[PDB]
Ligand binder design. Structure first.
Ligand SMILES: N[C@@H](CCC(=O)N[C@@H](CS)C(=O)NCC(=O)O)C(=O)O
Ligand SMILES: N[C@@H](CCC(=O)N[C@@H](CS)C(=O)NCC(=O)O)C(=O)O
Lengths: 214, 216
């Protein structure tokens, strides 16, 4: 009901999927043993890392020998295993299903379209079709938020926590999403919800590190 | 523990995500009332469809007023709500977590790389791009590794993760990809087909794959 040892997270501070897990752990009041894994120095490619995770990604979680990757899988695991109740990720099938669709939306649509837009910019202009696709995803998110304070209902869930990382990022990059009225208010709302749980320490700090490339 | 009337699925027979849902429903012994949704004709773009699903995607599920989209969320919902047991998606946090990683692998890695390789070929008449193939092949190597010492993707028993992943393997088989040298995938594929044959594997997955293959 609590881990026997600190849960290990192989991570980097600016990594968006790492930041999602880290904030989720803070809300759960789990103290993670953060292990800096420099993917630029091949630290994810040693015989040891590959044995743990042959897909060689961060974040990778190690909970008393149980290995897990995929940030959204880690988020839901931490709640299922160590939540004081199920508030962040309710067991009620229909409530859970809405959250799961939002998580699939995050991975398959929003985050992917975010990557396609900002990868060429942060590193090496905004391709028009990529800008169009990301804007389209924001429109959908805005609609998801109509009639509700959080993305999947009345309460903040793991879905809000991973989606907000992307919004923190584009905000730090100078992307203006205020015309999406629901997103604009949900963003302020969620920032305040996460304030006592390391939002500045984790998410803002991480976003500023990615922004330094601009 | 059963839906009060048949669950509705807005779909098209060849659609990979629709096929994953349809086979999941068969294994759980739920009848779906299938509603053909013609993307070409903009049947997913009516004010009515958009009200139901603003993302205007298929599959879209209507369980007696409850609307859901995203194939993998639909799959897990059907087990959470209507499974006679949780064998397809166990409640044990560790076993559930592994399945969730495989589902995220399927969406964010395998299926995406499948789309990037095959979509230009099938629907734009563009040539096979070895760069995009390399990415897909890399993911097949990972899947082969996931199957080292397990009969199924998440462990000892078949799960929703096997069902959605098998759609992709069915498609590439129909397209003429020979993956027999990925021995774990090869054996797993024969195993999972056998598991799914009493649950409409031919009528759903094989039929769907051949329809996509006619574009080649
Ligand atoms: N969908 C994965 C994404 C993980 C991912 O692609 N992480 C990047 C860093 S942001 C990485 O480890 N790249 C190095 C590699 O894949 O070899 C998740 O949410 O955890
Ligand atoms: N990630 C979604 C994929 C849904 C999807 O992109 N479906 C396609 C058909 S294969 C579609 O509805 N395209 C038409 C559109 O989005 O407007 C899932 O797993 O359900």
């Amino acid at each position: 009901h609590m881990p026997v040892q600190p849960i290990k997270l192989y991570y980097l501070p600016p990594s968006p999927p790492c930041r999602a897990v880290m904030m989720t752990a803070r809300v759960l009041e789990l103290d993670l043993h953060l292990i800096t894994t420099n993917i630029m120095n091949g630290e994810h490619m040693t015989p040891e890392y590959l044995k743990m995770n042959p897909q060689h990604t961060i974040p990778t979680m190690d909970d008393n020998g149980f290995i897990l990757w995929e940030s959204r899988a880690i988020q839901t695991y931490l709640v299922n295993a160590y939540g004081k109740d199920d508030s962040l990720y309710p067991k009620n099938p229909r409530q859970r299903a809405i959250i799961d669709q939002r998580l699939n939306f995050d991975l398959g649509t929003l985050y992917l379209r975010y990557l396609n837009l900002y990868t060429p910019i942060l590193f090496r202009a905004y391709d028009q079709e990529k800008a169009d696709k990301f804007d389209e995803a924001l429109g959908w998110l805005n609609t998801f938020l109509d009639g509700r304070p959080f993305v999947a209902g009345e309460n903040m869930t793991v879905a809000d926590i991973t989606i907000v990382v992307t919004i923190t990022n584009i905000d730090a990059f100078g992307y203006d999403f205020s015309s999406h009225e629901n997103i604009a208010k949900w963003f302020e709302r969620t920032k305040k919800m996460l304030e006592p749980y390391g939002y500045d320490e984790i998410d803002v700090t991480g976003a500023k590190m990615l922004a330094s490339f601009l």
